[PDB]
Automatic annotation (TrEMBL):
Protein name, entry field: Periplasmic dipeptide-binding protein
Binding site for L-glutamate: T20, G22, R355, Y357, K429
Disulfide bonds: C6-C234, C422-C435
Source lineage: Bacteria, Pseudomonadati, Pseudomonadota, Gammaproteobacteria, Alteromonadales
Organism of derivation: Pseudoalteromonas sp. (strain SM9913)
Length: 507
């Protein structure tokens, strides 16, 4: 049998390395590929994937991976492998991220947002081929987040043989478009705005694959996704509207699965754009937002109001004393004091699709628009197709934006470095457009130690700085929901990372 999965947007690529958009990663990462390691859902320890063993040196500047034997890359309509997975695949894959001599470093989008945002170029010095099935990563400095970054869904292994075969025909541009992986499913077809089609990998190394066919029905309209699951046009629906969760729960042939999840939804200001480059203005504007109203009207009581950028199930979580209280009277007084008594116009950019951390940015924005009109601030809401949206937030065209982050691992660094670091800013991935080296130094010092208490001290200081300076305003943490036909089994939702259908089956 097959499975139809209602997805909220196109994939922007079939290579996880070039994007941080959950919509793309959910479709491609766990389906077509494998990582060297993962985090075990039971023990929360690092788990063997394509690497069967890993040994960190005493200074922590060398990490050696022993690689799994007997792993085959996909045979597709456009590629037949002549050898199995080995060290050269790993060396090619990861050097493509930082090594200008790698012949794919500049191929395609030439952009590797997650890795560049966490400064991979300053991290990996080189990758040594110790043997056919063993590689040693050499680092410039020990970073306590290194293995966690290698467990991200961005850290998949690609095929060097495929890459080099395309290079010899000068077809390198097909490499990230027509993928070859070691994963449980294989690429068949992609029709932009319509569907993507995968089929089972009969040679999957890890286990026999249950489903014969996977189809992703690209349906950006959330109403339509619910309508489709009700009519059995889809078997699984992604990011079900929160307003319709009760309705689904009632149907006996529909399961609504849920998992507490590491994410944050926020309101970020373009701190390089007047008047939002002014702290008093940022402080003034957050006080005018009725957050309680949002928790009920947007999250429908399913959300958790933030007390920090970090959620309470993060080991580095610290609730902040200075979280702004909702007080329009104060807002008006602070606006006046800041020199903007009569207010101004501003844009709030709102996501067009439901996300774990914000089920309805549209409604959120209309609520805030109404709140802000009361202190003389005239909001226009800006929206685009989801991938276009992400692109244009990157060009920092916005005054402010409702966005967020669904954590990729349980390492607290994942909420900071990829989001508010200077490298993230320079990599075009900081929505607040905010570079603060003092902040950055905190993040660096937290990577300089593997001691959790020490790390947490630095993360506490980072959390305080975000609330004191308000590059973004933490709003809430969402619950991770997914709806599916009761006939579907084997899709457990996780507290972090992407959806996997590796174990999915029907009946």
């Amino acid at each position: 049998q097959g499975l139809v999965y209602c997805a909220e947007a196109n994939p922007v690529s079939f290579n996880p390395q070039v994007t941080t958009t959950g919509s793309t990663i959910d479709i491609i990462a766990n389906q077509l590929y494998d990582r060297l390691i993962s985090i075990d859902p039971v023990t929360a320890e690092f788990k063997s994937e394509l690497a069967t063993d890993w040994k960190i040196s005493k200074d922590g500047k060398s990490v050696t991976f022993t690689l799994r034997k007997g792993v085959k890359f996909h045979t597709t309509a456009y590629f037949t492998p002549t050898r199995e997975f080995n060290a050269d695949d790993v060396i090619f894959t990861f050097s493509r991220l930082f090594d200008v001599y790698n012949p794919y470093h500049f191929v395609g989008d030439a952009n590797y947002p997650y890795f560049q945002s966490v400064g991979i170029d300053q991290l990996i010095r080189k990758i040594v081929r110790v043997s056919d099935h063993q590689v040693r990563f050499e680092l410039f400095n020990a970073e306590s987040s290194f293995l966690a970054n290698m467990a991200t869904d961005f850290a998949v292994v690609l095929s060097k043989e495929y890459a080099m075969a395309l290079k010899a025909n000068n077809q390198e541009n097909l490499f990230d478009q027509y993928p070859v992986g070691t994963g449980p499913y294989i690429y068949k077809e992609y029709r932009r705005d319509h569907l993507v089609r995968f089929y089972k990998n009969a040679d999957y190394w890890k286990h026999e694959v249950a489903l014969e066919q996977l189809v992703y029905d690209i349906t950006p309209n959330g109403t339509t996704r619910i309508a489709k699951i009700l009519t059995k046009e889809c078997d699984v629906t992604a990011h079900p509207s929160s307003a319709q969760l009760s309705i689904l729960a009632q149907r006996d042939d529909i399961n609504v699965e849920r998992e507490t999840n590491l994410n944050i939804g926020y309101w970020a200001f373009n701190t390089e754009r007047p008047p939002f480059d002014n702290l008093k203005v940022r402080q003034a504007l957050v006080h005018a937002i009725d957050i309680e109203k949002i928790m009920q009207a947007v999250y429908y009581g399913n959300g958790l109001r933030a007390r920090s950028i970090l959620p309470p199930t993060s080991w580095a979580f610290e609730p902040q004393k200075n979280m702004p209280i909702f007080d329009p009277q104060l807002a008006k007084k602070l606006l006046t004091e800041a020199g903007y008594e009569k207010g101004f116009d501003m844009s709030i950019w709102a996501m067009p699709v439901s996300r774990i951390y914000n089920p309805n940015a549209r409604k959120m924005a209309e609520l805030m628009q109404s709140d802000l009109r009361k202190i003389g601030v005239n909001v226009n809401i800006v929206e685009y197709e989801w991938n276009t949206f992400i692109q244009r937030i990157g060009e920092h065209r916005h005054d402010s934006v409702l966005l967020g982050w669904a954590a990729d691992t349980p390492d607290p660094d994942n909420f900071f470095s990829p989001l508010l670091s200077c490298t993230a800013t320079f990599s075009g991935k900081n929505p607040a457009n905010w570079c603060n080296p003092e902040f950055d130094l905190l993040l660096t010092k937290a990577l300089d130690t593997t001691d959790l208490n020490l790390r947490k001290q630095y993360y506490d200081a980072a959390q305080s700085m975000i609330i004191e300076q308000l590059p973004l305003y933490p709003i809430a943490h969402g619950m991770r929901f997914q709806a599916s036909s009761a006939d579907v089994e084997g899709i457990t939702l996780g507290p972090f990372g992407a959806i996997s259908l590796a174990n999915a089956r029907k009946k």
